[PDB]
Each structure stands twice: as C-alpha cells, then as structure tokens.
Amino acid sequence: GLAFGAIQLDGDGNILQYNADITGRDPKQVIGKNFFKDVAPGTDSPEFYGKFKEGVASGNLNTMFEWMIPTSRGPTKVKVHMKKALSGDSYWVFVKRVK
Amino acid sequence: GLAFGAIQLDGDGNILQYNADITGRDPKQVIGKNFFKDVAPGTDSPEFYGKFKEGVASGNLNTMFEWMIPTSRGPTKVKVHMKKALSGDSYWVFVKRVK
C-alpha cells in the first residue's frame, strides 16, 4: 500500500503536513522541534528542563510546579504538570493558567 | 495567551504532538523529517529529488512523472505530481497508484 496520498514539503524537502483516514497537521509548525531549546526557551533551565530530564531518566516523571512567564506587562503565573504517558514511551507537559 | 494546553514530548524533549481548537498530530511520526533523505530514500536521486530542487529553485514547480517502487514481489508503478502550493511558500507531492 501507499503510505501517503499528499505530502506538504518546505523548500528543503522537510515534511510540514500530510494526508494518508490519516492526516498529519502542525498548524504551529513545531513538531520535531525541541520544546525546551527551540520553542519555549525560558524552560531551558534546571527548574523545568532539568526536572524533565530527571523524570525521564528515573523512569517516573510526575511533577507539578508553578512557572512564571515574563512579559512586557509583568509576569504571568502558570501551573505546569509533566507526566509520563500512560501508554508507550512519551511524556506530556500540561500548562494551565493559575486562577 | 497560552499557546499550548498539552504538548507531547519524546525523551529528548522533541515535540511529537500537541493540543492548543488547534491540534498537532503526526501519526506516522514524520513531520520535520526530510522526505527525500529520511522517509522515502528511493526518491533521493536526480529523477525525483533532483526535479524537486529544480522546481523550487526556478520558482515554478509543476512536474508529473511515473515512479517505480521496488518490492520483494516486483515493482509497483505510481504517478507522482509535484506542484508548488497555490498559497504560501510550500510544495505538495501527490502520489497515486497507476491503474
């Protein structure tokens, strides 16, 4: 069988999206990028990325903390929950605004 | 506003999928990979990748050709149409089985 019916590529040939029933979509164009180092660089620190690596390495990631997003108009507090997925080898980061 | 509600990461912190209304999904886990060099290496040749680079470089990609997929049970012929997207800077590869 054919894996894809239509594949969307950038000018370098890298896959953006595809149709196969099955669709790959990435409206923010972040899939494959590193969350800590590329997409949300404020998280690239021992207080966030550090806790992620610890939980991955221990095999038991389940940590919750508050996080400040500095802005031009003052910091915004969010609640972060990082947790290993219940099925398979992957991890979820949940972000919710506090109050 | 918050860009993501839930982000799925691999053990290295690379983004697999996300929820934001907006969802990023990649069931084949190929977004961000190179179509010609990683995902479909048989296309990494002047007869396919070469035509893609030509059309991207010329600014007018619109080429159609037949392509053979060797298998353990004999080759399968497909029809390939590569075309620049009508809106924005991206390119579509369409693959259809011949007859």
Numbering used by the authors:
A (entry chain A), B (entry chain A): 25 to 44, 48 to 126
What does the report in the manuscript say about this coordinate set?
One of the most promising protein among various FAPs is the so-called FAST protein (“Fluorescence-Activating and absorption-Shifting Tag”),14 an engineered variant of the photoreceptor from Halorhodospira halophila – Photoactive Yellow Protein (PYP). This photoactive protein covalently binds a hydroxycinnamic acid. However, the replacement of several amino acids (including the key cysteine responsible for covalent binding) allowed using it as an FAP with a group of fluorogens. In this paper, using NMR spectroscopy and X-ray crystallography, we have studied the structure of fluorogen-activating protein FAST both in the apo form and in complex with the fluorogen.
Through the whole of our study, we crystallized the FAST protein several times, either in the presence of various ligands or without them. Surprisingly, we found that the protein adopts a form of the ligand-free domain-swapped dimer in crystals under a wide variety of conditions. In this dimer, the first three strands of the core β sheet (A30-L33, I39-N43, and T50-R52) are exchanged with the corresponding elements from the symmetrical molecule, forming together one large twelve-stranded β sheet (ESI Part 3†). Contrary to X-ray data and in good correlation with reported previously, both forms of protein are present in solution exclusively in the monomeric form (the determined hydrodynamic radius was 2.1 ± 0.1 nm, which corresponds to the 15 kDa).
